[PDB]
Amino acid sequence: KKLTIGLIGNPNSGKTTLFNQLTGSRQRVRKEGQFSTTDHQVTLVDLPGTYSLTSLDEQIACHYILSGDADLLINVVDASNLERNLYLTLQLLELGIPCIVALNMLDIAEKQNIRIEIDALSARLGCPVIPLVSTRGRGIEALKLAIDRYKANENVELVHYAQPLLNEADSLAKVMPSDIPLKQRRWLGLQMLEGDIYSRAYAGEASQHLDAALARLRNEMDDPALHIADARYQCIAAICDVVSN
Amino acid sequence: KKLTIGLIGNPNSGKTTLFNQLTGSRQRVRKEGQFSTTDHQVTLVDLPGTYSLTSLDEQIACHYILSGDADLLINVVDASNLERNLYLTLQLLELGIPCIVALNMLDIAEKQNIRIEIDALSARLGCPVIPLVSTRGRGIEALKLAIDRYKANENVELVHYAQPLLNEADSLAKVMPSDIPLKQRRWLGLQMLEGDIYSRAYAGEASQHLDAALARLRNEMDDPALHIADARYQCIAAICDVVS
Amino acid sequence: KKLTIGLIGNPNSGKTTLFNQLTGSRQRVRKEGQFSTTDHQVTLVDLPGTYSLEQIACHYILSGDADLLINVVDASNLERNLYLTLQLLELGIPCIVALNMLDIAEKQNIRIEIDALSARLGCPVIPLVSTRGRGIEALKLAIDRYKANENVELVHYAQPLLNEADSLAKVMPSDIPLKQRRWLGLQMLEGDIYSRAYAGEASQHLDAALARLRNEMDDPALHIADARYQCIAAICDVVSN
Numbered sequence A: 001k002k003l004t005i006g007l008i009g010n011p012n013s014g015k016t017t018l019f020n021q022l023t024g025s026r027q028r029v030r031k032e033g034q035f036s037t038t039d040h041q042v043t044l045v046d047l048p049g050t051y052s053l054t055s056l057d058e059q060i061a062c063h064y065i066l067s068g069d070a071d072l073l074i075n076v077v078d079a080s081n082l083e084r085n086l087y088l089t090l091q092l093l094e095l096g097i098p099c100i101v102a103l104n105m106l107d108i109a110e111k112q113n114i115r116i117e118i119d120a121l122s123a124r125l126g127c128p129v130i131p132l133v134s135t136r137g138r139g140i141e142a143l144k145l146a147i148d149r150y151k152a153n154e155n156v157e158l159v160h161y162a163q164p165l166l167n168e169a170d171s172l173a174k175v176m177p178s179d180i181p182l183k184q185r186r187w188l189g190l191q192m193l194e195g196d197i198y199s200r201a202y203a204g205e206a207s208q209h210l211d212a213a214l215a216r217l218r219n220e221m222d223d224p225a226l227h228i229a230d231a232r233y234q235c236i237a238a239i240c241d242v243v244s245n
Numbered sequence B: 001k002k003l004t005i006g007l008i009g010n011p012n013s014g015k016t017t018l019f020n021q022l023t024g025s026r027q028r029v030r031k032e033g034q035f036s037t038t039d040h041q042v043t044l045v046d047l048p049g050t051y052s053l054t055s056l057d058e059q060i061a062c063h064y065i066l067s068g069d070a071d072l073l074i075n076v077v078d079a080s081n082l083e084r085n086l087y088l089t090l091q092l093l094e095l096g097i098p099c100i101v102a103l104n105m106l107d108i109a110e111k112q113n114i115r116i117e118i119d120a121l122s123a124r125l126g127c128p129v130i131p132l133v134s135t136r137g138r139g140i141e142a143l144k145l146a147i148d149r150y151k152a153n154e155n156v157e158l159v160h161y162a163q164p165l166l167n168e169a170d171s172l173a174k175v176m177p178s179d180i181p182l183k184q185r186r187w188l189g190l191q192m193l194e195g196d197i198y199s200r201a202y203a204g205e206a207s208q209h210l211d212a213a214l215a216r217l218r219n220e221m222d223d224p225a226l227h228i229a230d231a232r233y234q235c236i237a238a239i240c241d242v243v244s
Numbered sequence C: 001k002k003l004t005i006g007l008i009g010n011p012n013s014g015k016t017t018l019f020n021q022l023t024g025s026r027q028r029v030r031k032e033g034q035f036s037t038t039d040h041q042v043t044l045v046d047l048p049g050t051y052s053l054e055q056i057a058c059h060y061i062l063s064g065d066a067d068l069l070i071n072v073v074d075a076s077n078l079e080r081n082l083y084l085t086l087q088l089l090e091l092g093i094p095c096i097v098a099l100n101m102l103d104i105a106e107k108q109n110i111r112i113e114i115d116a117l118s119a120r121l122g123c124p125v126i127p128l129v130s131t132r133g134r135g136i137e138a139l140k141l142a143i144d145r146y147k148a149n150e151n152v153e154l155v156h157y158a159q160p161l162l163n164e165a166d167s168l169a170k171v172m173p174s175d176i177p178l179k180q181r182r183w184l185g186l187q188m189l190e191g192d193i194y195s196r197a198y199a200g201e202a203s204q205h206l207d208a209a210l211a212r213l214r215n216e217m218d219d220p221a222l223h224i225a226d227a228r229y230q231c232i233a234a235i236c237d238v239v240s241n
C-alpha cells in the first residue's frame, strides 16, 4: 500500500535533515520525496516549519494538516526544547491525526545533560516516540519500523479542560460542517473560545454562536480563554515534569 | 466538589513545604489548608512525620488513615533515601487507600547522582508517581492534574508472602468487624502476626485467634513476624533495583 | 513445586557468577545447583556460553528439561547480546532476561530504560551486577511471579516471508507447537543447515517455496537477516545510550 506522510515540527528541529536521510535524491521541489519501507511505498512531504497551527509558512502547513490528505504524520521534535516543541505536538494529537513523534537532536539534549524517559512520553502522548540523531542517521531503522506498525493513536486523555469548557465546545462542534471529524470540530470549538481568529474559517457558520458562548462561560469562570490556556499549559508541564528530569 | 487529602510521609521529607506551596496563607492550626483544582475544592491535612504505621506520631497518622476521613493521600517521598521512604509507601498501598506518591528532594538526589525511572516505579506501585519540580511550576501542575484524575490504585501485587502467611491473615480477616472493608481487614491480620499492638484493638474478636494462629504457623515456619518483614524488605529492595 | 531453570547467554556474561550466588557455591569463572525461593525449590542448570543456535548449551534448550530460562545479558554490549535473546523469544520459550555487568556499562556511560526493553521483549528484565551482589532479590521474586511471555510482535518480516513460513509449518510434525514450527520454516528459508531434522514433511515443499519468493523479492534470506537486524537496532535506539 502507498502512504503519504508529512514531516511537521518547529523551525530548526531537523525536518530537512530527516527528509534528506529518508529520501536523498528522490525529491521534487511543496517539497515531496519517495522511499520504501518493508510493507509500504512512502511519499514524504516536507511541510514548512511552524511553532503553532495558530506566519506565511504557518498557513501553508495548517490548511494541509486540517485537509486530511496524509495518512500519517512524523512530528519532528527538538529534544533540547521539549516544552516549546510539545505545543504543536499537542495540537496534532488533540486533532486525532495519526502521529509518530521523532525525538530529534538527542546528542544536543545529552550534552546539555537533558534526559528524556521515552516510554513515559509515549504513554502520555498516546503515540510512538522514536529517538533520533538525524545528522548521523541514528534511529532511522526504528522510525521505518514504527511506520509499518502504525495503528490509530491511543484515545488517551490529553488536556483536562474545565467541564463547562467541554460542554460549550461540543455545543459549537455539533453545528460545524458534517464532513469534519468530531475530534477536529471539538478542537476548533476550543480554538474559537480561546480567541483564535483564523480558526473560524474552518468552523463553517458556527462563529455566530461564539460571543454568546463566552457570555455564558463568564458566568461560571473568571476568563474562559485563560482557563483554556491554563489547561493546555498544565498538560505540557505535567508531561515535562514526569518525562524530563 | 469537595475532596479531603492527607499528606503522609517520613519525618523531614518536605510535607509542610508542599503544604505551604499548595495552600499559601489559606491555612489554620493539626494543620489544615485549602486549595482549588480544575474540578475540586480540596482540603489538605498535614499529618505528622512517621516512618511506619506498624511514639504518638505513628498512631496519629495511622488512626487518621483508617478513619476514612481522607478520600486520597499524597505520599511525600524523599527521593534521596528511596528505600527508607518506601516502607511507609508499601503499607499505604497494602491498605488500599488511593495514593499519589510525590517525589520530593530532587535537588539532593541530583547531588549524589541518583536516577529514578518514574514510570517503572508507578507501574510497580499501582499509583501515579509525581516528581516535585519547582521550575515553571511543573510539580504543582502535575500534582493538581493527578488529583483531578484520581481513581482507585491499580490492583498489582506488591509483596509476595508465603502461602501459610496469606491463609492465616485471611482467616483472621474473616473474623474482624464487618464495618471495615476486606482489604483493610486482611492487612490488619498481617500486622497482628507481626506483633502490632494498634491492630489488635481494631481487630476486636480476632485477637482471640492470634495465639492459635501463631502456633498453627509455628509448625511450618520458625518465625512468622520475621518472614513478614523480610518479604516486605524483599519487595522494597526488588523495586529499588529495577527502578534505580 | 519443583522447577528446572537453565542459565543461557553469551560467553563471559557473568552466567557462572550468577550460579555461584544463587546456589551458594564457588566455581572457576554443565553443572547443577539447588536453591529455594519463597514458593519453589529450584534446580539451577548452568550452561556454557553461546552466541546463537556452543553445541553443549544448544541441546539443553531444544529438549524440554527446563520450565524457564534466565537469559543472562551483558549491558555494556547489549546489541551483540540480543541476537540470542530474540531467538528464545521467537521460539516462545519462557525466559527472564537478566541484565548483568551494569557497573561496566555505567563505566562506559550507557543508560538503559529497563521497562522499555521489557515491554518490547515481552518478558521480565532484571538488573543485577553479580560481583557486587544486587539484583538477587528482584530475580527470586521474578521467578515466583513466572508466567507465559507476552504475545508481542518482535521481528517484522515481509508478508511473503510469513506466508511461506506458515505453509511450511502446516505440513510440519504435529507434536511441536505452532510458534516453534513457524520459526523453523523461517530458518529453512534463510538456509539453516541443522533444521531438516525436525522439518519432516516440510522438505518436499522447501524447493518450490524459495522460487515463489524470489519472484517477488530479490533476496529472501537477507530480508530475514535484515528484519532481525532492524528489530534489534530499533530496540537498542529506543531503549539505550
Ligand SMILES: CNc1ccccc1C(=O)O[C@H]1C(=O)[C@H](n2cnc3c(=O)[nH]c(N)nc32)O[C@@H]1COP(=O)(O)OP(=O)(O)NP(=O)(O)O
Pocket (backbone or CB within 6 Å): A009, A010, A011, A012, A013, A014, A015, A016, A017, A018, A048, A049, A050, A104, A105, A106, A107, A108, A132, A133, A134, A135, A136
Ligand atoms: C552547517 N551549519 C551548522 C553548523 C553547526 C550546527 C548545525 C549546522 C546546520 O547545518 O544546521 C542544521 C543541522 O544540520 C542541525 N541538526 C539537524 N538535526 C540535528 C541532529 O539530529 N543533531 C544535531 N546535533 N544537529 C542537527 O540543525 C540545523 C537545522 O536543521 P534542518 O534545516 O534540518 O531543520 P528544519 O526543521 O528543516 N529547519 P526549517 O526548514 O524549519 O527552517
Ligand SMILES: CNc1ccccc1C(=O)O[C@H]1C(=O)[C@H](n2cnc3c(=O)[nH]c(N)nc32)O[C@@H]1COP(=O)(O)OP(=O)(O)NP(=O)(O)O
Pocket (backbone or CB within 6 Å): B009, B010, B011, B012, B013, B014, B015, B016, B017, B018, B048, B049, B050, B104, B105, B106, B107, B108
Ligand atoms: C529555612 N530553613 C532551612 C535552611 C536550610 C536548610 C533547611 C531549612 C529548613 O527549614 O528545614 C526544612 C526545609 O526547608 C528542607 N527542605 C524541604 N524541601 C526541600 C527540598 O526540596 N530541597 C532541600 N534541599 N531542602 C528541603 O527540609 C526541612 C524540613 O521540611 P518540612 O518541614 O517541609 O518537612 P516535613 O516532612 O514537614 N518535616 P516533619 O513535619 O515530618 O518533621
Ligand SMILES: CNc1ccccc1C(=O)O[C@H]1C(=O)[C@H](n2cnc3c(=O)[nH]c(N)nc32)O[C@@H]1COP(=O)(O)OP(=O)(O)NP(=O)(O)O
Pocket (backbone or CB within 6 Å): C009, C010, C011, C012, C013, C014, C015, C016, C017, C018, C028, C029, C047, C048, C049, C050, C100, C101, C102, C103, C104, C128, C129, C130, C131, C132
Ligand atoms: C578472575 N578475574 C578476571 C580476570 C581477568 C578477566 C576477567 C576476570 C573475571 O571477572 O572473571 C569473571 C568476573 O568476575 C567478571 N564478572 C562476572 N560477572 C560480573 C559482573 O556482574 N560485573 C562485573 N563487573 N564483572 C563480572 O567476568 C568473569 C565472569 O565469568 P563467568 O564465567 O561468570 O561468565 P560466563 O558467561 O559464565 N562464562 P561462559 O561460560 O559464558 O564463557
Ligand SMILES: [Mg+2]
Pocket (backbone or CB within 6 Å): A015, A016, A046, A049
Ligand atoms: Mg526544512
Ligand SMILES: [Mg+2]
Pocket (backbone or CB within 6 Å): B015, B016, B049
Ligand atoms: Mg512538617
